[PDB]
Design an enzyme around this catalytic site. Structure first.
Site, mmCIF file in Angstrom:
data_model
loop_
_atom_site.group_PDB
_atom_site.id
_atom_site.type_symbol
_atom_site.label_atom_id
_atom_site.label_comp_id
_atom_site.label_asym_id
_atom_site.label_seq_id
_atom_site.Cartn_x
_atom_site.Cartn_y
_atom_site.Cartn_z
ATOM 1 C CG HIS A 13 -1.924 -1.140 1.198
ATOM 2 N ND1 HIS A 13 -2.948 -1.252 0.280
ATOM 3 C CD2 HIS A 13 -2.015 -2.231 1.998
ATOM 4 C CE1 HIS A 13 -3.628 -2.360 0.518
ATOM 5 N NE2 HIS A 13 -3.083 -2.970 1.552
ATOM 6 N NE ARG A 21 -1.652 9.802 -7.979
ATOM 7 C CZ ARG A 21 -2.038 10.816 -7.210
ATOM 8 N NH1 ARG A 21 -1.296 11.916 -7.154
ATOM 9 N NH2 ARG A 21 -3.161 10.734 -6.496
ATOM 10 C CG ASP A 22 -0.869 6.321 -16.843
ATOM 11 O OD1 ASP A 22 -0.554 6.409 -18.060
ATOM 12 O OD2 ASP A 22 -0.128 5.777 -15.991
ATOM 13 C CE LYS A 40 -5.961 -6.343 -2.310
ATOM 14 N NZ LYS A 40 -5.058 -5.798 -1.266
ATOM 15 C CB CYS A 81 -4.849 -0.424 -9.164
ATOM 16 S SG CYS A 81 -3.488 0.761 -9.085
ATOM 17 C CB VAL A 103 -6.087 6.493 4.427
ATOM 18 C CG1 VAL A 103 -5.784 7.126 3.068
ATOM 19 C CG2 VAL A 103 -4.960 6.767 5.365
ATOM 20 C CG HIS A 114 -6.245 -4.088 7.522
ATOM 21 N ND1 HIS A 114 -6.530 -5.012 6.536
ATOM 22 C CD2 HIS A 114 -7.409 -3.437 7.766
ATOM 23 C CE1 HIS A 114 -7.806 -4.925 6.203
ATOM 24 N NE2 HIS A 114 -8.361 -3.976 6.935
#
EC number: 3.1.27.-
Length: 123
Positions: A13, A21-22, A40, A81, A103, A114
């Protein structure tokens, strides 16, 4: 010294300074971090400095949240993603969504171990 779970959290992460950031960024980093066997379904990366991320475990940058998590006070640049297509096996095609917000993480012994990805899968 930092146990394996925190180390693993960073692998899955954290990406300090990404370029664009494409979609191609997503497809490449998901492979690089070994999240493609199986692919994932969705995964979010946080950008910026590690210092601010660990600080979420303290009252300096975090508030208790729900049953056992913590939510950050500051906002972070992030990239989610999302797997495109109907197969769990490589090649994994990902679509990228850049965002900027706080976040939610789970802390263990003062370290993030996590990430709650639910706040990023916009149904």
């Amino acid at each position: 010294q930092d146990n394996s779970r925190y180390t693993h959290f960073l692998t899955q992460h954290y990406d300090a300074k990404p370029q664009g950031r494409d979609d191609r960024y997503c497809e490449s980093i998901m492979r690089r971090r070994g999240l493609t066997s199986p692919c994932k379904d969705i995964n979010t990366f946080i950008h910026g400095n590690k210092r601010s991320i660990k600080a979420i475990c303290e009252n300096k940058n975090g508030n208790p949240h729900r049953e056992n998590l913590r939510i950050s006070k500051s906002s972070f640049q992030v990239t989610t993603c999302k797997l495109h297509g109907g197969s769990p096996w490589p090649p994994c095609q990902y679509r990228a969504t850049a965002g900027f917000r706080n976040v939610v993480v789970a802390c263990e012994n003062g370290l993030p171990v996590h990430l709650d990805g639910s706040i990023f899968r916009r149904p």
